[PDB]
Amino acid sequence: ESDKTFPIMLNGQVNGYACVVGGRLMKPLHVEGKIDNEQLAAVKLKKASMYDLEYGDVPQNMKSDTLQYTSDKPPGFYNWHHGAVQYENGRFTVPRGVGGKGDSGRPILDNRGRVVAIVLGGANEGTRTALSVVTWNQKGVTIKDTPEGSEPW
Amino acid sequence: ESDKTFPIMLNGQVNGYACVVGGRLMKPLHVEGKIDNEQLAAVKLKKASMYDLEYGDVPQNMKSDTLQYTSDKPPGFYNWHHGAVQYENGRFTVPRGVGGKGDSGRPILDNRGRVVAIVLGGANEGTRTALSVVTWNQKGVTIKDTPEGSEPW
Amino acid sequence: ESDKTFPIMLNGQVNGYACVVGGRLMKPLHVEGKIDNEQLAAVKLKKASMYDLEYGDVPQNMKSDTLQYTSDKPPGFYNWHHGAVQYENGRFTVPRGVGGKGDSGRPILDNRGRVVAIVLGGANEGTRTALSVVTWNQKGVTIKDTPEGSEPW
Amino acid sequence: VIVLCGVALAILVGIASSAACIAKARRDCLTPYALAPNATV
């Protein structure tokens, strides 16, 4: 499940989503709008425009409800908002043309109830849909992965 | 059924209504009041004061959700918020005595679930309770029919 | 019941409550934020600094359901948010450690259904946990009471 | 200077007021068509 994550809203479009990980709000930077969980809108964000992401410390009153990220990224299936994604060749891969635009800020989760990465948007060569995403190094280095020509979702 | 319609509210209480037809929202001008849907509230209304109405184009994210208008009006019962009204000789006739203030902006519907008129007000002359309404002519041009004394509801 | 008593909200938290007695809206003054109801929010609240309250006049539509107060309050059990309060020795009291912050503005009511008082806080030493409370002497006079050192909830 | 400003004022009032009149007439003449997206003007 993902209900501990919330949509950003503008014009009436759930134009993206946001996640509470490690006590920090995370949302795509390229996506603007009202984060549906209005308490998250009280947070003042800090930006990482090279990663197209921004973050801010979630208020203490619910900070203990935050999800937690992983160092684990072995190849295999990971639970996703559209069922699952296959991590392979060290890349997040999805069937050709499924899910898509509107999923900016959607999480990808460890079966143990942890978050392995956050998606930004996809690309697709034809064999599979390739995902652009922000991930984590084994020593905690946050690193964005983005297949070439990846579109924003 | 009526879920496509939306209330207009003043002092935190509904005091009128609005509806979306062909992708154009309309609300009575005489009804001072805000609109529930914040995306509808974002639209810039155009003051069609000659019809005691104001309208604005709603964005394409609700393109499919607008009501469809129909100009054909065979004499018969047409659906309404409180039931139905007998159309006769061009007059929209309410079974006398039902309805009142606070109900402007309510659509009037064909049995096919398509909008044919909008409530502006109403009264009785000596035989039936006439409703003042805005509607479209046989040629499709919109027109305001308002038997005298059909004060705005 | 007291179902319709109205919560006060601030930063998403239920920071208080409010009530309407004999058509006169009353809420704590020390309770920050706003009433979650827009009909009540339209009331131009007037400060009652000595009484730690603020009162206005509600739209008269609720004249049929505004909470009936009663001043006469013999010692005994009275209905309350956390089930009930024990009234004795002229002071309102509760079991130790129950309730707390955000309960400001919760009314007290006769099991016949008549409100009698409003909670402001409490204290613990020597007896049952007493509530700082505004009361209505048989003269019909509103009176504020504060057990020594009661914190404002 | 008085008559020159008179000319300027009269021309500006004539143009802007006639344009406002025309715009109002156009606006409310199209309004029965603007409210009729399912009809052809």
Side-chain angles (χ1 to χ4, degrees), chain C residues 10 14 26 29 42 45-46 70 76 80 105 116 121 125 141 148:
Chain C
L10 176 62
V14 178
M26 298 173 62
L29 171 62
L45 269 299
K46 181 160 49 178
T70 204
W80 190 49
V116 56
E125 288 196 55
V141 173
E148 289 68 23

Side-chain angles (χ1 to χ4, degrees), chain C residues 56-117:
Chain C
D57 187 3
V58 303
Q60 296 88 349
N61 68 68
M62 62 200 71
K63 68 192 167 73
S64 60
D65 202 27
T66 171
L67 292 81
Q68 179 63 60
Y69 92 97
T70 204
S71 164
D72 38 355
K73 54 176 173 57
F77 314 110
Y78 290 82
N79 298 6
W80 190 49
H81 176 36
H82 304 286
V85 298
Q86 177 71 316
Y87 188 62
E88 203 189 57
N89 320 297
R91 305 211 292 202
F92 286 98
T93 72
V94 296
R96 196 72 56 73
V98 313
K101 296 184 187 288
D103 302 334
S104 274
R106 290 300 301 232
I108 297 92
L109 168 139
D110 167 11
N111 71 303
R112 275 72 60 88
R114 293 84 65 102
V115 295
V116 56

Side-chain angles (χ1 to χ4, degrees), chain B residues 48-102:
Chain B
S49 60
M50 53 74 81
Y51 287 157
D52 187 15
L53 199 80
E54 64 197 336
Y55 82 103
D57 185 15
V58 301
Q60 67 278 2
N61 56 285
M62 60 270 284
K63 62 193 175 181
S64 50
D65 302 2
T66 185
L67 284 302
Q68 179 179 26
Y69 188 81
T70 284
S71 54
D72 292 355
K73 301 176 209 71
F77 303 101
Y78 289 84
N79 303 95
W80 175 47
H81 187 83
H82 296 293
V85 311
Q86 172 73 2
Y87 174 84
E88 67 88 28
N89 299 294
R91 306 187 195 96
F92 282 86
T93 74
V94 155
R96 57 169 289 103
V98 62
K101 288 189 176 288

